[PDB]
Protein backbone atom coordinates (compact mmCIF):
# COMPACT_ATOMS: atom_id res chain seq x y z
CA UNK A 1 0.00 0.00 0.00
CA UNK A 2 3.25 2.13 -0.69
CA UNK A 3 2.76 3.03 -3.55
CA UNK A 4 3.98 6.31 -6.00
CA UNK A 5 1.38 9.16 -7.64
CA UNK A 6 0.43 12.11 -5.23
CA UNK A 7 -2.93 13.34 -5.02
CA UNK A 8 -1.92 16.94 -6.00
CA UNK A 9 0.84 19.13 -6.97
CA UNK A 10 1.79 19.80 -10.74
CA UNK A 11 2.96 22.58 -12.95
CA UNK A 12 3.14 21.48 -16.12
CA UNK A 13 6.02 22.96 -17.39
CA UNK A 14 5.92 24.35 -20.79
CA UNK A 15 5.87 22.83 -24.49
CA UNK A 16 6.27 26.56 -25.78
CA UNK A 17 9.33 28.11 -27.40
CA UNK A 18 9.90 32.01 -27.29
CA UNK A 19 12.20 34.29 -27.50
CA UNK A 20 11.63 37.24 -29.44
CA UNK A 21 12.97 40.00 -27.93
CA UNK A 22 13.67 43.83 -30.13
CA UNK A 23 16.05 44.70 -29.97
CA UNK A 24 16.21 48.06 -31.07
CA UNK A 25 15.72 47.61 -35.34
CA UNK A 26 13.92 48.95 -38.13
CA UNK A 27 15.45 52.49 -38.91
CA UNK A 28 16.62 53.06 -35.22
CA UNK A 29 19.90 50.57 -36.49
CA UNK A 30 21.72 52.27 -39.58
CA UNK A 31 21.15 55.90 -37.48
CA UNK A 32 23.02 55.13 -34.19
CA UNK A 33 25.55 53.90 -36.82
CA UNK A 34 25.83 57.02 -39.24
CA UNK A 35 25.59 59.53 -36.65
CA UNK A 36 28.62 58.20 -34.90
CA UNK A 37 30.69 57.86 -38.00
CA UNK A 38 30.36 61.59 -38.58
CA UNK A 39 31.12 62.19 -35.19
CA UNK A 40 34.20 60.37 -35.76
CA UNK A 41 34.94 62.40 -38.94
CA UNK A 42 33.96 65.64 -37.47
CA UNK A 43 36.89 64.95 -35.01
CA UNK A 44 38.80 64.93 -37.62
CA UNK A 45 39.30 68.12 -39.45
CA UNK A 46 40.07 69.52 -35.93
CA UNK A 47 43.42 67.51 -35.74
CA UNK A 48 44.75 66.71 -39.26
CA UNK A 49 44.08 70.12 -40.03
CA UNK A 50 45.70 71.28 -36.78
CA UNK A 51 48.63 69.40 -37.02
CA UNK A 52 49.04 70.75 -40.97
CA UNK A 53 49.58 73.81 -39.12
CA UNK A 54 52.68 72.25 -36.40
CA UNK A 55 54.20 70.84 -40.11
CA UNK A 56 54.88 73.96 -41.29
CA UNK A 57 56.57 75.38 -38.15
CA UNK A 58 58.63 72.02 -38.34
CA UNK A 59 59.95 72.73 -41.45
CA UNK A 60 60.15 76.89 -40.26
CA UNK A 61 62.91 76.11 -37.82
CA UNK A 62 64.53 74.55 -40.56
CA UNK A 63 64.54 77.51 -43.66
CA UNK A 64 65.43 80.13 -40.43
CA UNK A 65 68.72 78.21 -40.29
CA UNK A 66 70.40 76.64 -43.04
CA UNK A 67 73.18 79.96 -44.47
CA UNK B 1 92.47 74.52 -60.31
CA UNK B 2 93.47 77.10 -57.27
CA UNK B 3 91.96 77.05 -53.73
CA UNK B 4 92.59 79.53 -51.38
CA UNK B 5 94.98 78.91 -48.20
CA UNK B 6 94.95 77.15 -45.22
CA UNK B 7 94.25 81.27 -43.88
CA UNK B 8 90.72 82.38 -44.54
CA UNK B 9 89.92 79.18 -42.30
CA UNK B 10 89.58 78.66 -38.76
CA UNK B 11 87.40 81.40 -37.78
CA UNK B 12 85.61 81.65 -34.37
CA UNK B 13 83.42 78.26 -35.04
CA UNK B 14 79.70 78.08 -33.24
CA UNK B 15 80.06 75.50 -31.27
CA UNK B 16 77.16 74.43 -29.59
CA UNK B 17 74.68 71.05 -29.86
CA UNK B 18 71.77 70.72 -32.24
CA UNK B 19 68.78 71.49 -29.75
CA UNK B 20 70.28 74.36 -28.38
CA UNK B 21 70.79 75.60 -32.12
CA UNK B 22 67.09 74.40 -32.71
CA UNK B 23 66.28 76.53 -29.50
CA UNK B 24 65.73 79.96 -30.44
CA UNK B 25 66.64 79.51 -34.72
CA UNK B 26 63.32 81.33 -34.81
CA UNK B 27 63.66 84.69 -33.81
CA UNK B 28 67.59 84.50 -34.98
CA UNK B 29 66.78 84.68 -39.02
CA UNK B 30 64.26 86.89 -39.54
CA UNK B 31 66.13 89.71 -37.97
CA UNK B 32 69.26 89.62 -38.94
CA UNK B 33 68.63 89.66 -43.19
CA UNK B 34 71.61 91.40 -44.24
CA UNK B 35 74.55 89.08 -44.24
CA UNK B 36 72.51 85.90 -44.89
CA UNK B 37 70.15 86.66 -47.70
CA UNK B 38 73.01 88.08 -49.68
CA UNK B 39 74.97 85.65 -49.02
CA UNK B 40 72.52 83.39 -50.96
CA UNK B 41 72.46 85.28 -54.29
CA UNK B 42 75.83 84.91 -53.56
CA UNK B 43 75.97 81.43 -53.72
CA UNK B 44 72.60 80.80 -56.17
CA UNK B 45 72.66 83.62 -58.47
CA UNK B 46 76.49 83.03 -59.08
CA UNK B 47 77.62 79.38 -58.32
CA UNK B 48 81.82 78.29 -57.39
CA UNK B 49 81.78 78.50 -53.66
CA UNK B 50 85.49 79.49 -53.64
CA UNK B 51 85.45 82.95 -54.78
CA UNK B 52 82.10 83.88 -51.75
CA UNK B 53 84.17 83.45 -48.92
CA UNK B 54 83.65 87.09 -47.60
Given at each position: KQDMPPVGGYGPIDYKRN??????SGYSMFAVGIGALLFGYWSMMKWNRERRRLQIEDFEARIALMP | VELPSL???????????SSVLKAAAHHY?????KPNKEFMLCRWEEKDPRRCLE
Amino acid sequence: KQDMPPVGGYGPIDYKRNLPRRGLSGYSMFAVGIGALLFGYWSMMKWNRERRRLQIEDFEARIALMP
Amino acid sequence: VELPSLEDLKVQEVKVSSSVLKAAAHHYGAQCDKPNKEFMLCRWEEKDPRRCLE
